[PDB]
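Assemble and predict.
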Amino acid sequence: PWADIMQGPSESFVDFANRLIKAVEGSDLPPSARAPVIIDCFRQKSQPDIQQLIRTAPSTLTTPGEIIKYVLDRQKTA
Amino acid sequence: AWTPLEPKLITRLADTVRTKGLRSPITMAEVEALMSSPLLPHDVTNLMRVILGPAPYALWMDAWGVQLQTVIAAATRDPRHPANGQGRGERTNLNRLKGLADGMVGNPQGQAALLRPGELVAITASALQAFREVARLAEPWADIMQGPSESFVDFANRLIKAVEGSDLPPSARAPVIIDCFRQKSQPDIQQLIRTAPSTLTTPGEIIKYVLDRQKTA
Amino acid sequence: AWTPLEPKLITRLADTVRTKGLRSPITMAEVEALMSSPLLPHDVTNLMRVILGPAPYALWMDAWGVQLQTVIAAATRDPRHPANGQGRGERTNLNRLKGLADGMVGNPQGQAALLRPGELVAITASALQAFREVARLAE
Amino acid sequence: AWTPLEPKLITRLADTVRTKGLRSPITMAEVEALMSSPLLPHDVTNLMRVILGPAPYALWMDAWGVQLQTVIAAATRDPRHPANGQGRGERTNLNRLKGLADGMVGNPQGQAALLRPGELVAITASALQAFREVARLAEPWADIMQGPSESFVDFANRLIKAVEGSDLPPSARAPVIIDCFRQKSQPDIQQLIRTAPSTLTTPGEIIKYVLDRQKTA
Amino acid sequence: PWADIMQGPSESFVDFANRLIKAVEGSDLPPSARAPVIIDCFRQKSQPDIQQLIRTAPSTLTTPGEIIKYVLDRQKTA
Amino acid sequence: AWTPLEPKLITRLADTVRTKGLRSPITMAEVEALMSSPLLPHDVTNLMRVILGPAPYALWMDAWGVQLQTVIAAATRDPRHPANGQGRGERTNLNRLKGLADGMVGNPQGQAALLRPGELVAITASALQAFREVARLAE
Amino acid sequence: AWTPLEPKLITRLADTVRTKGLRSPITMAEVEALMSSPLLPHDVTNLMRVILGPAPYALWMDAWGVQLQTVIAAATRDPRHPANGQGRGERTNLNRLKGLADGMVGNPQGQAALLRPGELVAITASALQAFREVARLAE
Amino acid sequence: PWADIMQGPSESFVDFANRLIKAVEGSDLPPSARAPVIIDCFRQKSQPDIQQLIRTAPSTLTTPGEIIKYVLDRQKTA
Amino acid sequence: PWADIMQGPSESFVDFANRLIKAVEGSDLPPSARAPVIIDCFRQKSQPDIQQLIRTAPSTLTTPGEIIKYVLDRQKTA
Amino acid sequence: AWTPLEPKLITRLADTVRTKGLRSPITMAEVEALMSSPLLPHDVTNLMRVILGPAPYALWMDAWGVQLQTVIAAATRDPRHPANGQGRGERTNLNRLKGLADGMVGNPQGQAALLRPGELVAITASALQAFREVARLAE
């Protein structure tokens, strides 16, 4: 179930994005509703450090690929 | 007439990407191999759908679009593009490049019918550059030190890897590699390079000199 | 027309170099095998980029340049080089050997167009000797 | 007519070199100041004899000779040198540049008589470049870290100083300074630079951004 | 008096913002000088935790509403 | 002719917002009730000044401006806006929407004189959407 | 003919900047003093290299570029700029303002030859404004 | 006296070179005999670490400045 | 036998070189194989201090005479 | 016609070198004595083979080669060398000086036939200087 996917405290972001995109594209949603759902799940899941990282984006991110690129650039190396 | 790529080659390439990663030189060589004949947008799109995961595939779609847009800007900046024609009726729109134009959506046969060879090679080069960008993006040189027990060839391999797989310009890699050989590479090799009667002006020459005069231990 | 080497053979050769090393006689035999047809500078350059690590690749670039320079000295010492021609307009510069000349930089098709078979075999022998030197030097 | 430089200015410059050193930007500015009018070999030779110690003076004589030899090679490579003439009888030998030619040894008046203005400016530029070389030689960027208690402007000053006063090419200083800002500069500022909504492509822009958004403490 | 308004140690930020905007708009300042004054009072008043929170803003905040939104997002829940 | 809203209704709505909050469905229903007739910029501005605190009022001014700008972009994207006219001389500027145009600043009578009914309904819908945004943002 | 600024004045100004700082009114007065005659890009560049530290010098290069770009935008917005000419062949490019144009790179004599007095005063005012910005930013 | 100058166990090399060049140039030697004497004093004084450093010079050093530059380059940082 | 010649712990280097060159030239080797053998015996015999001295030669020594000269220059006086 | 040096004188000189050493003034005087008449490369080579040990002989071969190379550089710098001739066909190669040229290898009679007296005196002076260098180097 896509709506139950959370980014674990120790999980990296690319694994979380892979799992989420897999569960959203392999589901019962229409094809035209996958990108907005993936974006809004990146924003509300993806534990509050990345949540604030996406929130304070000086540019407007309108695509899952752009969000992934931005987060991978500005992520907290740890 | 359109002929699909072998699923055996595609499966082997997918497993190569799965084990070696996106950035290994063997993987880029394999991609260049399967990028030899000019591919139709359908072929490259399905290829990247199969070999790349979901998130790298999204990144690659973005990068491919950006590179194709740069190509179309250069095309409107020069009416002699091998994708363009002489009159204005042959100007190539992004719907024709991404395979979204009329008579092409989902049909590879019609795609191969209406597309130009210049269109195909431009699409292919754009896709290759986008793959390179995404590979460089998906996965620090100034923090590399030669360990107390590490050999010098391992340190040189690690350093050259991290310097060439970084964000430096191509014309700034050799001086950085040299100056990192001189300041890293624990003080025995530092003094060995310092007291070089000849002037070493290349990483290969420094490596050869150090391998010759190194303290066998 | 340029045809690339199989990435399957290149992957097998890379794993051979990874397990057996650079100096084993089986590795040199495999390199001689993949060095059978005269290769263009693009082919040999990418091959050494893939099979060799970063530091051995730097060493190999150095050694290849030195051997090509010896070849060009022998070429200016004999106007009957299979890479040269009879007139002075066919003299072969190192930009043409290393693939740096005009119409060749980054393009293997144009490379295969302008290059001579003698040029190709000289480049290939030079690359093989450079590989031997670097293998003897690395370990 | 030859006029000597003031011993007061020379004494002040010597004390500047004594307190600030050879490589400080104020010292190089003062040398450029006293290197304004084209000097005769006698003037520059005595100036370097007075302001430099014995060993730096030996080094400077060596470097000046090498630079003058490069100048004479360029002069024999171009008959239109402002020191040369059109015919072969005006070709300038190193004895005339170093002040060793006939009618010049030890006599500044005769020196000023026979020398050309192009000769003077070439000698002067050669001496300035030699001074720069010796100053860079007489007295490590990749070992610079921002201390736990150090401010960011001090760290940036130290890093830019060590990078610009090093053996790197001029075209490789800005990328190195940027990549050292990103990997040094302890992880709070590292994350501050990483999460930059804009792309910072200049050390000045990075410094401005960090100074704006820094944690006041 | 607007220039004497400080955020108390126990006061929330929305109460402080309400009080400050009230005192600044109900004062003798020209209409074109209220927003810059409100911003610069948010930055120098509003006890040093929120001061540092506003200082380390990756984006440039150029409006009292934007500053209020940012602070309400990233405030220390307590 | 301009008629003001009853201060009794405004006081009741202010106390509703004070006890129930900004986001309760009863509060949104009450706002929709007092948002029934098309209001002039003066009316909505004073209403939000009274019912909202200082910080929510700043947020609401921001959001109202943004929504009005979207409306004006749609208006320049379609010359058939009920606020626009057919010729270019009836194009509606943001000074006329926010009540800042000439003959309107501070005067509700002149405001009601020069404004169009389409202008009024667009301003009203914009203010309602801005209130929804701020209510979703405040808590 | 180009005449350099006295290194004595430059040394005194550098020590003034060292003791008083960048923002003191005495320092700005001294800079205005040494900014009296229109300077060539070489002069201002070397002056800021000597009086400013490395990081303030980087900041000043950035700010000077931005201000010169604003000047060039105003210049393309008005063909009557004292740096411009009447025809299109006298339009002033940023390579000519920053001293990067042909016949100017590293040579102050040629610089003084090809530059216009309007060019010089515009460069000087731009450099002064950039110095003010950097001084306000550094402390 | 120039012929009594030794590089101390703790003294740096530039101080030793300064002292030696001072004592040699401020002495009774002819001007044409100072450079060879300075070189041969660099080689025989200047305690055996620097002695061996100068001895094993792949290039031939024929000037006090060149010897000083070489030693400063390849000296044992300590 | 040349292949059994070692430099003794107390023996000087010129004596060792004399003994080695004597035994190599007065042996059954071809004339064209004496110099490489003498060099490679200098490198592997000649106890590890001189071994490291020859190893760390900034120049390439390609003759027994050159090796002897280099070692005599940079040898540890004792 | 070639006449060999007496083995009695050579034995006495060898014992002198054995007891007094290479650097004694008596030894250098004796060498100058046996270096009086211009010797052929064969004579000097055998003389140094007999009087010098193996390692000094290697050093002396090196030094003799270097000095002969300096002589040949001076010879190509002056066509009036007593070893050279006027035309280019008499230019003296190092194979002719070291006795390696055609018709000379191992044969002292042919050597004495083809060699010039200037060649002989140059070879002799070169050998004497090389002996001096090696003697100064050995101890």
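Helices of chain F lie at 7-20, 25-34, 41-51, 54-76, 94-97, 108-114, 117-138.
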